[model samples]
Target: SVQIVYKPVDLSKVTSKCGSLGNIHHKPGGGQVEVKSEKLDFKDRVQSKIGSLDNITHVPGGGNKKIETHKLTFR
Candidate 1:
């Protein structure tokens, strides 16, 4: 069986690093504590924006393309 559960914890609740992934994918075996965090959602957004600015972002485009670079202009 495969199951992913989100558990908010001290590692993510601390104001110092509220949006950081405190090792979600590095764990081996099953029954790992994943996070669907409100903080990380915005954190990911900020990273994506920064990534696009650096021309280092990649995402799925509309059609006929396997992947496309994410570019955003901050107005």
Candidate 2:
């Protein structure tokens, strides 16, 4: 046997409508709806110049072919 009942909500004939229920309530100086103020102008100009090996010079060419040693015979 288990029973519980409780209900009481009249909020003085509740009638609150703001964002839904056929929203229509904004007639008080409604002739100026120019909300345009969003400016994020980034011309974007990045110039970076600072690098040098100072006339890189490494001269050593004319000796690269000496690797032949083979010995394998089995029959």
Candidate 3:
């Protein structure tokens, strides 16, 4: 499980600090609850933006890869 500490400013919600898992290979288990707001659709949520100026997998391209796919499924 992971914890997300955040506060919204203007039209953006900023993450204060997140748990460091060293490096995430994939998803994990468990969950929690806090505040809620109107959710955006997949198209509106997932962004191709890597949150970086440069874009690339290698070199001094960017800080991290753009893995912002907002697809959701429930059981």
Candidate 4:
């Protein structure tokens, strides 16, 4: 399992004492912990929790914005 350290995690149901924005759950450097069975599952989890994609108004074959890779980690 992988432990995620970021911010605003569930904290044993003590949600958002800090705050929540859309799907992100943590502060800038609070280092929340997330447990996952496998890396694939973790990636799926991240994709799901990444929230709705930002739609681009105009571009050549533009699509929804992808999440930044920095938001993810293996630890």
Candidate 5:
């Protein structure tokens, strides 16, 4: 079975900075710059967690099923 996961990104830390002086001097002091971190590695970690769960077998019968849980195991 497949599961759908919702990952929300924090936008409060995302900011754009601009220069106070606009093209007045020969060299601008500050310019517009967007700051954001790459989430590729973060997303890979999530996918790895999901993939680990895909190999588990859930039995519906009256047999005791040993399931390996990964709650709070991510470092």
Candidate 6:
């Protein structure tokens, strides 16, 4: 069985100008993290978090948003 140990990232490392606009939590299961931010203007934060990373996607919902990536592929 494959398991992804979710870890919380330091909030200060997220934003340089201001504090983190959202909350990030370690979710159970494999390869998953939860971002909780209601009414958080997160465009800047998103940009900051997404530096040099690819294939990650952002979906909007219920005042919060979902950031995910493609499933790993190994041959």
**After superposition, candidate 1 runs with Cα above 4 Å error:** 1-27, 39-75
Q: Ten residues in a row with the worst lDDT in model 1?
A: 47-56
For model 2, residues 3-35, the per-residue Cα lDDT tens digits are 555555544432333443443444344354444
Per-prediction count of colliding residue pairs? 0, 0, 0, 7, 0, 0
Taking the tens digit of each residue's C-alpha lDDT, what string does model 4 give over 1-75? 956667754334322233332443432334555756655434343434433345343322323444434455354
Over 4 Å off, model 2: 1-42, 45-47, 51-55, 63-75
Whole-model lDDT per candidate: 0.37, 0.45, 0.42, 0.42, 0.42, 0.47
The root-mean-square deviation over C-alpha atoms between each candidate and the true structure, in angstroms, is: 28.5, 39.0, 25.5, 25.3, 27.3, 24.1
Candidate 3, superposed: residue stretches over 4 Å from native = 1-58, 72-75
Q: What's the TM-score of each model vs. the native?
A: 0.13, 0.16, 0.14, 0.13, 0.17, 0.17
Clashing pairs in 1: none
Residue 10 lDDT in model 1? 39
The sequence of per-residue lDDT tens digits that candidate 3 reaches over residues 1-75 is: 865555544554433444452442433223543555496456455545322345343323224444434433544
What's model 2's TM-score?
0.16
Instruction: Supply the TM-score for candidate 5.
Output: 0.17
Instruction: Please give the TM-score that candidate 3 achieves against the real structure.
Output: 0.14
The deviation in Å at residue 45 for candidate 1 is: 11
| Minimal lDDT window, size 10, model 5 | 45-54
Segments of candidate 6 deviating more than 4 angstroms: 1-30, 42-75
Per lDDT, the best of the predicted structures is 6
Backbone clash pairs in model 3 (N, Cα, C under 3 Å; residues 3+ apart or in different chains), count: 0
- Please give the lDDT score for candidate 6: 0.47
lDDT of candidate model 5 versus the reference: 0.42
